[PDB]
């Protein structure tokens, strides 16, 4: 959106880069930050932790009714069965989409997101546009922004995550997938479908 007061993106990035490098130099001299520490955090959230972990949980739930029961009863313990858990997902509660209920997750006050199963949030999730509107007009938002039409007779539950309890959406299994393997099913599970802004991939 046009703001006549705002600098160019290039000038903003140049100033931020200098301020961050200065702060970095001071924390390094204090002995509390190192370049190797920075590189490890980046490697974890670029390559080790991401929505492929959440997809594994979803497909097991789709294909193992006993595991699905455990997942809905205690999401943290169920995900630990697969070695999935940790920072920013210490307390997870999974909610099941059905033919009468659709779930969508937001954090209106900030940016909290279940890192151990989804990785770091995409920028739109943290930004004021999604956060302000999804609690007020979720049906209109899902249609206009995500092309996802939830019939007006179907209840939409918006989970505004104001605490450390992380809500994760278990999307419904798409039709036409009877007997598919766990690997084939995982290709239909997206981070958007575990936020509730889209269903799992069709076909």
């Amino acid at each position: 959106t046009e703001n006549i007061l705002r600098k160019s993106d290039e000038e903003i990035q140049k100033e931020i880069t200098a301020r961050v490098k200065a702060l970095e130099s001071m924390l390094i001299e204090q002995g509390i930050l190192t370049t190797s520490m920075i590189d490890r955090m980046a490697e974890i959230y670029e390559n080790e932790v991401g929505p492929h972990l959440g997809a594994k949980v979803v497909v097991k739930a789709w294909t193992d009714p006993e595991f699905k029961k455990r997942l809905l009863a205690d999401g943290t313990e169920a995900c630990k069965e697969l070695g999935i858990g940790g920072l920013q997902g210490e307390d997870m509660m999974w909610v099941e989409n059905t033919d009468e209920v659709h779930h969508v997750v937001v954090c209106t006050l900030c940016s909290c997101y279940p890192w151990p199963v989804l990785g770091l949030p995409p920028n739109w999730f943290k930004e004021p546009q999604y956060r302000s509107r999804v609690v007020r007009e979720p049906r209109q938002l899902l249609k206009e922004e995500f092309g996802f039409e939830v019939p007006p007779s179907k209840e939409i539950k918006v989970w505004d995550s104001s605490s450390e309890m992380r809500f994760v959406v278990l999307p419904q299994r798409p039709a036409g997938t009877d007997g598919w393997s766990e690997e084939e099913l995982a290709t239909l599970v997206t981070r958007e479908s575990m936020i509730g802004v889209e269903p799992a991939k069709a076909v």
Binding site: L5, I12, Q13, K14, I16, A18, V20, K21, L23, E24, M26, L27, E29, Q30, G31, I32, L33, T34, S36, M37, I38, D39, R40, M41, A42, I44, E46, L87, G89, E90, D91, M93, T108, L109, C110, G119, P122, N123, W124, E127, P128, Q129, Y130, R131, S132, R133, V135, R136, E137, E145, P152, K154, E155, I156, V158, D160, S161, S162, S163, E164
Partner: protein, 228 residues
């Protein structure tokens, strides 16, 4: 507090910007800002609730339009100054230095392995906020409760759009660190945590979807009984 970060129900912020795929980190400075979180946490700059309170005190126009990880930089500096661990005058001198010498090296330092071990342990072990308390929960599933009209200036998780509203308790999660104390430097003071369901009509009036509800997390002091 009642700051612009409390956006739930606000209008006019514009269309969602969703660039078809994006990287995890858009620039090298974002990786640094991200990793400063465990480093400053370990060093006693702030806990998680204090971290959020620091962001909440940003210039509001800067908050609405600046890159997300810039918010984290602002909170590090805020708590660095608060704890006396960051000298602002030295920070401004180093900023000018890196403005004029952007490729100048960082200071010589040892790659202390304990700091990396800390990262691995934090990431895969977590930092759980759940706590044991002696008292049982005051409320239970199905209780009809009303959210406090209090408007504290300090940190809280009391979105304006739910204040004074009536809802139904859906789940009791146990007790957790209480943001209204922890974010203001008053300690964990753990309180029982509930999810409460508010109908869209209760929140928004007649503009509300008759088939939608908002589920909002309430620590025990936030709610009082209406009907058991």
């Amino acid at each position: 507090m009642n700051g612009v970060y409390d956006v739930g129900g606000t209008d006019g912020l514009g269309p969602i910007n969703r660039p078809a795929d994006e990287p995890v980190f858009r620039a090298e400075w974002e990786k640094v800002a991200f990793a400063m979180f465990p480093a400053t946490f370990r060093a006693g700059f702030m806990g998680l609730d204090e971290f959020k309170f620091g962001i909440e005190q940003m210039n509001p126009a800067e908050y609405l339009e600046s890159p997300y990880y810039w918010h984290w930089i602002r909170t590090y500096i805020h708590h660095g100054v608060r704890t006396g661990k960051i000298d602002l005058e030295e920070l401004e001198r180093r900023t000018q230095y890196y403005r004029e010498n952007p490729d100048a090296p960082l200071p010589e330092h040892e790659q202390k392995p304990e700091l990396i071990e800390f990262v691995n342990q934090a990431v895969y072990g977590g930092l759980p906020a759940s706590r044991e308390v002696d008292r049982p929960p005051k409320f239970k599933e199905g209780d009809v409760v009303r959210f406090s009209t209090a408007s504290p200036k300090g940190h809280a998780r009391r979105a304006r759009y739910v204040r004074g509203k009536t809802g139904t308790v859906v789940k009791h999660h146990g007790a957790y660190i209480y943001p209204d104390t922890a974010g203001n430097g008053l300690g964990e003071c753990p309180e029982h945590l509930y999810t409460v369901r508010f109908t869209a009509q209760e929140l928004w009036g007649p503009e509300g979807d008759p088939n939608s509800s908002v589920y909002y997390d309430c620590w025990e002091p936030y709610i009082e009984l209406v009907d058991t």
